[PDB]
Amino acid sequence: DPDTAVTNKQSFSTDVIYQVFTDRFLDGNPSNNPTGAAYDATCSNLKLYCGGDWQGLINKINDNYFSDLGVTALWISQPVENIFATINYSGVTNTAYHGYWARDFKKTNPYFGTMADFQNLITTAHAKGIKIVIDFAPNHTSPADAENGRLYDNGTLVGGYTNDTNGYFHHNGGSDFSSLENGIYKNLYDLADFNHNNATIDKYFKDAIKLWLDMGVDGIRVDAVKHMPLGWQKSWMSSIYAHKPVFTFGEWFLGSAASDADNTDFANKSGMSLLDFRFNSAVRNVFRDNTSNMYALDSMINSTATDYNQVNDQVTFIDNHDMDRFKTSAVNNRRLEQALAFTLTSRGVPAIYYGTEQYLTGNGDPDNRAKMPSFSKSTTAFNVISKLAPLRKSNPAIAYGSTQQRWINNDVYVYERKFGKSVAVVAVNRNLSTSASITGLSTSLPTGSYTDVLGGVLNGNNITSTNGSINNFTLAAGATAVWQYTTAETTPTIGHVGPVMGKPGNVVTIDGRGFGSTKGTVYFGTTAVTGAAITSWEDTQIKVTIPSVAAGNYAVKVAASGVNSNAYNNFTILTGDQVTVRFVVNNASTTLGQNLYLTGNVAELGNWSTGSTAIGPAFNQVIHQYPTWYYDVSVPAGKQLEFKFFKKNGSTITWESGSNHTFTTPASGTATVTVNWQ
């Protein structure tokens, strides 16, 4: 199957994601709409249910609204049963229309549809080459008070937030958001926090997602990743990747293109991507708010490409469920159109929040979750997506391409996306009133005459190369032209690998060009993977079995016909199955600004390193207070580990003295190991 094929659940780079609040799209079946106050036909009270369902989505798929738009994957609201009750925050009746207040992760939300409806929707999407991505919010249940934040395991009850004897939840009050630990271990407002170190919860959630992947979901958009321990998440991911690997991204909110240490961290160590708020901010500051210029935009591109191990897996967007719509009264259509184009031709997996093609407005929650107004295919923005979306599939330079600043200034940007012998050039002039005389533009386009892929719908123009040298031209006011160049690759050149972390035995997908149809050999580091280990092999996609080599960070290489492909770095190989173990050290007092890390005899703790590979810095305030620190780590299961803490501050490392501490991990689930600092 090609990298392109709907089948490719491990890579979304060639797709376009359509984010849609299920309830706010189409009530394709009235026979399942809420009754009474908890419902509102008009859908004027955005806080109540409006009727949207899975049949509605099915209908749109079937009349090619999506197929005409160009979107290749739907991102739906969480499908699980949510609380049936209603909460009255400040006199206003609030419903769980959003999907985010789960009560039974093992049952479908009746208001969206049934299990068979869901199955019906998973089959109809694949038939048209559309993938389905789902929201999964394992952080918490529903707001305490609605239903005492109860959780049912497929009907049967697990426990409520109150008189929670076995401790399935956290009872440390709610997060004031003053630190990463305060956000992880304390509730989100009234949202009942689950205690993941609790083993039945750890297993409830591995068992839950398993069910959904089993039914055919193609990707999972995890919610509130900054509110759950990394260690746990990673372990959960290894469970998923070991069963049915699927593209997983999470939401870790940021408020700028500004780099963030914990953000970049999670993005490179959890085993899942993030939503690109750094990008979003720059895309909005330049195109929307007029608070930064093309420089800011370019500066973001280089920096993100530099911070994230695999920038191509981040998920770009111009707006979403947690912000003001891109469109407002001062923002004009061309500007929306420009942001879309910029995003569709950009690096990463892009997502369009529902109704952007219909210029929908709505500032803040919930006005930005208005009902889908039209199914019009005429808008210019609708046009732009249909034109461009298809390119991610046809041109691999858009999909896996690098980015090169080829001409820039305050209003004008011309960047280059190139992968192997393929290219795409994109010129953007955010100035709505004055055009720009471009002189001395240089690209990698072979000599020839190029026609703006956008047929001029965004005042685009044609160009002419002369061995990369483009002839002098004028870029009209508010223009944006795209000129590409494609050809058959003849050299194994790796474009993606999914997932990027796993234990030996798992199956990974390598996407790219020029692999030929004759099984060569894979290279996990310096270890050739051949023959039967290579489950599948064709020009654009090779499915290969992760060899059983020492856990660690490898680079992947595909050698087709003796020619070695380029190397895909930072591919993480696990020791084996994981379990989440909480490490607690006592009397581990420190000096001002001195911190506590952890490392031991397995790649998962960092193989005795004191660097960027050691676990930490351990927490010291919510679950355990200073001088006791603690930190939840993903760690090989069943195996006996040796570990040791260490304080680190200026540059100087002080290891605990005496022998190494020891712990033989549990064969499954979770565990806690307490130790005294030596």
Q: Which residues are annotated as a binding site for Ca(2+)?
A: 27, 29, 32-33, 51, 53, 139, 184, 193, 227
Rounded least distance, CB 169 to Ca ion, Å: 9
- Does residue 32 interact with Ca ion by CB under 5 A? yes
Nearest alpha-carbon partner for 518 in 479, 553, 567, 558 = 558
Supply the minimum distance, in Å, between the C-beta of residue 185 and Ca ion: 6
202 binds Ca ion (CB under 5 A): no
- Which region among 48-56, 116-124, 250-258, 405-413 touches Ca ion (by CB under 5 A)? 48-56
Query: CA–CA distance from 346 to each of 340, 448, 483 (Å)?
Result: 10, 24, 14
**Would you state the structure tokens that stand for residue 268, as one six-digit string?**
């490179």
Which residue is associated with the tokens 């189409």? 26
> Smallest distance, Å, CB 188 to Ca ion?
7
Measured from the CB atom, the residue of 83 and 453 that comes closer to Ca ion is 83
**Of residues 124-183, which lie at the interface with Ca ion (CB under 5 A)?**
139
Least CB distance from residue 175 to Ca ion, whole Å? 8
List the interface residues with Ca ion, window 442-501 (CB under 5 A): none
- Cite the annotated binding site by residue number: 27, 29, 32-33, 51, 53, 100-101, 139-140, 184, 187-190, 193, 221, 226-227, 321, 365, 369
- Asked if 105 contacts 80 with a C-beta cutoff of 8 angstroms, the reply is yes
The region of 20-28, 301-309, 513-521, 605-613 touching Ca ion under the rule CB under 5 A is 20-28
CA 617, chain centre distance (Å): 25
Distant-in-sequence, close-in-space partners of 197: CB < 8 Å, separation ≥ 6: 232, 580, 582, 632, 670, 672
Query: Does 27 participate in binding Ca ion (rule CB under 5 A)?
Result: yes
- The CB-of-193 to Ca ion minimum distance in angstroms stands at 4
Contact between 117 and Ca ion per CB under 5 A: no
Asked if 53 touches Ca ion (CB under 5 A), the answer is: yes
Q: DSSP state, 285?
A: I
Residue 656 sits in the site that holds Ca ion (CB under 5 A): no
Q: What is the dihedral of CA 225, 402, 482, 287, to 10 degrees?
A: 40
Question: Least distance to Ca ion from the beta carbon of 658, Å?
Answer: 35
Cβ pair 70, 389 in contact under 8 A: yes
The residue whose two tokens read 């970049």 is 264
Cβ-based nearer residue to Ca ion, 218 or 223: 223
Task: Tell the smallest beta-carbon distance from residue 117 to Ca ion (Å).
Answer: 10
Q: Which residues pair with 579 in a beta bridge?
A: 635
Q: Which stretch binds Ca ion (CB under 5 A): 188-196, 391-399, 593-601, 639-647?
A: 188-196
Nearer to Ca ion, 196 or 325 (CB): 196
Residue of minimal Cβ distance to Ca ion: 53
Is the CB of 51 or the CB of 245 nearer to Ca ion?
51
Establish if 51 lies at the interface with Ca ion (CB under 5 A).
yes
Q: Please, which residue, 187 or 383, has the CB nearer to Ca ion? A: 187
- How many residues contact Ca ion, by CB under 5 A? 9
In the complex with Ca ion, the residue whose CB is nearer, 168 or 419, is: 168
CA 196 to chain centre: 21
Residue matched to tokens 């004008």: 412
Contact region with Ca ion (CB under 5 A), list: 53-61, 250-258, 264-272, 663-671: 53-61
Q: Minimum CB separation from Ca ion for residue 3, in Å?
A: 36
The span of 33-41, 326-334, 455-463, 546-554 binding Ca ion (CB under 5 A) equals 33-41
Segment interacting with Ca ion (CB under 5 A) among 26-34, 356-364, 551-559, 576-584: 26-34
Residue 27 or residue 117: which is nearer to Ca ion going by CB? 27
What residues are paired with 425 via a beta bridge?
Answer: 416, 483
Bond from prior residue into 110 cis (ω within 30 degrees of 0): no
| 94 in Cβ contact with 100 (< 8 Å) | no
- Choices 1-9, 51-59, 83-91, 469-477; region in contact with Ca ion by CB under 5 A: 51-59
Look at residues 385, 359, 351 and name the one whose alpha carbon lies nearest to residue 20: 351
User: Shortest approach of Ca ion to residue 186 CB, angstroms?
Assistant: 7
Find, among 275, 379, 284, the residue nearest to 324 by Cα: 284
Rounded CA-CA distance 582/576 in Å is 18
Cβ 191 to Ca ion shortest distance, Å: 8
Question: Which residues contribute to the annotated binding site for substrate?
Answer: 100-101, 140, 187-190, 221, 226-227, 321, 365, 369
Query: Residue 610 and residue 615: Cα distance in Å, rounded?
Result: 9
In the complex with Ca ion, which residue's Cβ is closer, 223 or 319?
223
Closest CA to 181 of 630, 673, 649: 630
Partners of 136 in beta bridges:
222
The alpha carbon dihedral of 24, 28, 32, 35 has a sign of positive
Handedness of CA 581, 582, 586, 589 (dihedral sign): positive
Under DSSP, the state recorded for 470 is P
Give the tokens for residue 111.
Answer: 């208001």
Tokens representing 678 are 């030596």
Cβ burial, residue 44 (10 Å; 0-12/13-18/19+) = exposed
* Span from 28-36, 290-298, 491-499, 667-675 in contact with Ca ion (CB under 5 A): 28-36
Compare residues 184 and 412 and give the one whose CB is closer to Ca ion.
Answer: 184
Residue closer to Ca ion (CB basis): 8 or 29: 29
User: What are residue 85's phi and psi, to 5 degrees?
Assistant: -65, -170
The yes or no reply on residue 23 touching Ca ion (CB under 5 A) is no
* Active-site residue set: 223, 251
Q: Where are the beta strands (DSSP E) in 365-515?
A: 402-408, 412-419, 422-429, 436-438, 448-450, 463-465, 473-475, 480-485, 493-498, 501-502, 507-513
- Collapsing DSSP to helix, strand or coil, 38 comes out as helix
Residue type, 495: G
Give the whole-angstrom CA distance, residue 325 versus residue 280. Answer: 12
Helices (H), 63-150: 65-69, 115-127
Q: Give the side-chain half-sphere CA count within 13 A for 561.
A: 11
Q: For Ca ion, give the closer residue by CB, 191 or 213.
A: 191
Question: Rounded to the nearest whole angstrom, what is the least distance from the CB of residue 391 to Ca ion in the complex?
Answer: 35
- Residue span 222-241 as binding mask against Ca ion, x where in contact by CB under 5 A, dash where not: -----x--------------
* 33 binding Ca ion? (CB under 5 A): yes
Could you list the residues that contact Ca ion (CB under 5 A)? Answer: 27, 29, 32-33, 51, 53, 139, 193, 227
